[PDB]
Amino acid sequence: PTCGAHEFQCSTSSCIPISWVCDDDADCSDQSDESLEQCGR
């Protein structure tokens, strides 16, 4: 499923807040947030 408007879903129904993306922290289990595509680094 999908998470709410204030949550960004990484993978496998685990979502983090919008400010928690590209903030030097792999909060998610799949670490999809800091990937070169979403972060660009």
Q: Which residues bind Ca ion (CB under 5 A)?
A: 20, 23, 25, 27, 33
∠4-12-28 over CA atoms, to 5°?
80
* Distance in Å, CB of 26 to other proteins, minimum: 13
Between 1 and 18, name the residue whose CB sits nearer to other proteins: 18
30 binds other proteins (CB under 8 A): no
CA 5 to chain centre: 13
DSSP letters spanning 22-41: SSS---SSS--TTSHHHH--
Contact residues toward other proteins (CB under 8 A) are 19, 21-24
